[PDB]
Amino acid sequence: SFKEGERVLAYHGPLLYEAKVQKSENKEDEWRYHVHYLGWSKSWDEWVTNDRLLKLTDENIRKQQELEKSQ
Amino acid sequence: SFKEGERVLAYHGPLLYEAKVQKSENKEDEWRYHVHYLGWSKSWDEWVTNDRLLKLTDENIRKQQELEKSQ
């Protein structure tokens, strides 16, 4: 699971954006994460589930790049 | 982390009692567990943190036994 302060990749629409986890919570055997999209307004901060996020690894950054290159 | 429905050992005072996890929640990087002590009044159902609980393993059951014998 993702930790508070952790930088991640996050979908917002079909592209991946760098984000930071502000809060992590689990109820009913499900994680939710309140994320801030880096360089975006705080108005876009929101709760998301695991399926919206990727660990900030070079492997997942390559996924970000592939999506950028295929437009 | 313990799961809903899981039987555990729980301190209530210095002895260990079998209990069941009713609900598990995590906030601020901390699990809490709402437990029912088996055979006890529902009045005693309560939220506890990890320090109050032990996995139902043979080693921890042996700890329960040791505490009973040193009573």
Author numbering:
A (entry chain B), B (entry chain A): 10 to 80
Reported in the publication:
As a “Royal Family” member, the N-terminal chromodomain functions as a histone reader that specifically recognizes methylated histone markers. Herein, we study the binding specificities of the chromodomains of MRG701 (the homologue of MRG702 in rice) and MRG1 (the homologue of MRG2 in Arabidopsis). Both the MRG701 chromodomain (MRG701CD) and the MRG1 chromodomain (MRG1CD) specifically bind to H3K36me3 and H3K4me3.
Only MRG701CD in complex with H3K36me3 produced crystals that diffracted to 1.4-Å. There are two MRG701CD molecules (molA and molB) in one asymmetric unit (AU), and the r.m.s.d. between these two molecules is 0.140 Å. The trimethylated lysine binding pocket was formed by the following five aromatic residues: H37, Y42, Y62, W65, and W69. However, no extra electron density was observed in the trimethylated lysine binding pocket. Comparing the structure with other MRG chromodomain structures, we found that W65 in the aromatic cage was stretched toward the center of the cage. Two MRG701CD molecules are related via pseudo-2-fold symmetry in the crystal structure, and they form a dimer interface along the β2-strand of each molecule in an anti-parallel manner. Specifically, both E50 and K52 on β2 of molA form both hydrogen bonding and electrostatic interactions with K52’ and E50’ on β2’ of molB, respectively. In addition, W56 on β3 of molA contacts W56’ on β3’ of molB via π-π stacking interaction.
